[PDB]
Design a protein around this ligand. Structure first.
Ligand SMILES: */C(=C/C(=O)OCC)[C@H](C[C@@H]1CCNC1=O)NC(=O)[C@H](Cc1ccccc1)NC(=O)C(=O)NCCC1CC1
Length: 181
């Protein structure tokens, strides 16, 4: 087996989890230690179902930029025995574009799902259900409901979390390493 498939499968195995909040089904990315990240609109409460058990959330942090504008990411710290494999070195120090990215989804409804979203470009501002959002990127792929949390990735790099779409395009919140330091 080759490098790109091996990397995405290993991600699925170690870092990308099936979860459910009161808002329904999402893909969650575990980054290091007890720190994971979800799309903000998933509204994780005091607990979150992770794969096969209800896990308690010790802390949630909604990321805003310097303007106080929503970045549509929530850092959660879990009460678990698990330490996630540390993947912070796969996340670029700044929000980076990519060519021929793959969206990795892992939901009860869409388990271990690989979606070739193609090239990923800077987008910046995006208006989501009346919520304005910054630092987004775009891919021209008709992404759909149930795919939020999905992990945008390419050549051993983890560059975004899927958050939205318009029926023709999809959009992710971009990752940078400092969010997880
Ligand atoms: C993922 C969440 C989900 O499935 O829950 C039910 C909504 C979902 C994926 C996109 C839906 C349609 N196609 C997709 O790829 N995202 C959303 O539903 C988000 C929710 C959101 C995000 C930020 C703040 C508040 C809510 N919203 C949208 O996709 C959206 O509101 N509008 C699409 C058009 C606007 C981008 C121009």
């Amino acid at each position: 087996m080759g490098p790109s498939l091996d990397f995405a499968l290993s991600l699925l195995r170690r870092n990308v989890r099936q979860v459910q909040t009161d808002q329904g089904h999402f893909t969650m990315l575990g980054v290091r230690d007890r720190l994971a990240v979800l799309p903000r609109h998933s509204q994780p409460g005091k607990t979150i179902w992770i794969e096969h058990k209800l896990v308690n959330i010790l802390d949630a942090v909604e990321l805003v930029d310097e303007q106080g504008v929503n970045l549509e990411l929530t850092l959660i710290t879990l009460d678990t025995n698990e330490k996630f494999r540390d993947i912070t070195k796969f996340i670029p120090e700044n929000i980076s574009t990519a060519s021929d990215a793959t969206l990795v989804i892992n939901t009860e409804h869409m388990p271990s799902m690989f979606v070739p979203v193609g090239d990923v470009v800077q987008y910046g501002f995006l208006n989501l259900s009346g919520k304005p959002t910054h630092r987004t990127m775009m891919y021209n792929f008709p992404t759909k409901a149930g795919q939020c949390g999905g992990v945008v990735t390419s050549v051993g790099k983890v560059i975004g979390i899927h958050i939205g779409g318009n029926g023709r395009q999809g959009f992710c919140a971009g990752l940078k390493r400092s969010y997880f330091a």
